[PDB]
């Protein structure tokens, strides 16, 4: 069409982008570099994230996004118009339709906040979408119908559990404690046991080559190793982490994310409960990713724990596809 139909995810760590009538046009972190001192950009997405560590003191790789909601304005708007752009397949006639996956637990003001972005990112109408109902939606469970459908989407920024029913979410829970607040715990690991500074990015790296959360053979086998500065000596130091210790370090975090599936269950009319315990719990999230999250998962629940199937685009899919799902469309916040 003249007007594309856009979805958008914008996350604090990735920034997914849905073409009504194409699929995923846009898969890019959430980063924009710039020139610490005239203000103008050099790259942002992919090429800016490699940046993030390893810039002078005259660039300033950016990370807009941090807790699901915008951390610096300007800055996010200036990501969330390229991104649209990039996708828009260049400068129509029409300005697009725009729905943006946001958190749940999100305040009035850090809502306008988007609701505004979306506009100044030039776009005629902007429209909020709660992230686990696209999830949920860019995964074709029927969320229209009245039977329950729990989502638990750990994101790069936030951990959201919903409970889905007739369009709309029943009871939830929202911390702000998922993917990045994982990296930190490794990286902060690494540091207070092995005195050795390591960089948010080898973390990251640790996080997805060896990270786990429950005990098993295959599991504690897992090896790598990261690369940074030893403390104590002043001296670059490359040494050795287990899968083991990856996982214990995780703990504290795995914890809230369990707690918050707990508490949101205790507090879901049990009609609903009869229904997800049948269905099963649906996980998804980049974040979500940790190795045996889900048997974990399913074991401190009791109730089946199903992985999505394309977790990193569930939220840009849905956000999309909500569009052409009216029924449930009237009942978001635009602008
Ligand atoms: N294989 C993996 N194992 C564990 N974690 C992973 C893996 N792959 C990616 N991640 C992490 O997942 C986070 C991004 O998850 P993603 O679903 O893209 O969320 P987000 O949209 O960027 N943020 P949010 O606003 O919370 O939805 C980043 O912290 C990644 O490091
Ligand atoms: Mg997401």
Do not use: H
């Amino acid at each position: 069409m003249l007007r594309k139909d856009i979805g958008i995810d914008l996350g604090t760590a990735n920034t997914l982008v849905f073409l009504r009538g194409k699929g995923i046009v846009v898969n890019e972190p959430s980063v924009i570099a710039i020139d610490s001192t005239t203000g103008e950009i050099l790259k942002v997405g992919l090429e800016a994230k490699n940046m993030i560590g390893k810039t002078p003191a005259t660039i300033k790789a950016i990370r807009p996004m941090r807790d699901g909601v915008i951390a610096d304005y300007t800055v996010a708007l200036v990501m969330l118009r390229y991104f649209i752009n990039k996708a828009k397949g260049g400068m129509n006639l029409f300005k697009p339709r725009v729905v943006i996956g946001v958190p749940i637990g999100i305040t009035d003001v850090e809502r306008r906040a988007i609701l505004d972005a979306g506009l100044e990112a030039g776009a005629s109408k902007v429209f909020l979408i709660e992230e686990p109902m696209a999830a949920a939606i860019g995964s074709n469970l029927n969320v229209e119908e009245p039977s329950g459908n729990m989502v638990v989407d750990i994101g790069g920024g936030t951990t959201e559990v919903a409970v889905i029913s007739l369009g709309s979410i029943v009871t939830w829970e929202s911390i702000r404690i998922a993917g990045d607040e994982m990296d930190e715990a490794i990286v902060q690991y690494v540091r207070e046991t092995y005195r050795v500074a390591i960089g948010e990015r080898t973390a990251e790296r640790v996080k997805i080559e060896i990270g786990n959360v429950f005990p098993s053979k295959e599991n504690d086998e897992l090896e790598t190793t990261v690369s940074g500065i030893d403390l104590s000596t002043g001296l670059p130091r490359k040494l050795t982490l287990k899968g083991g210790e990856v996982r214990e370090a995780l703990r504290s975090v795995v914890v809230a994310i369990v707690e918050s599936v707990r508490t949101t269950l205790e507090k879901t009319p049990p009609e609903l409960v009869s229904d997800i315990i049948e269905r099963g719990i649906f996980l998804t999230g980049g974040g979500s990713l940790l190795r045996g999250l889900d048997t974990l998962l399913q074991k401190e629940t009791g109730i089946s724990v199903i992985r999505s199937e394309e977790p990193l685009t569930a939220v840009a899919k849905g956000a999309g596809m909500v569009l052409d799902k009216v029924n449930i469309l009237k009942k978001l916040q635009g602008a």
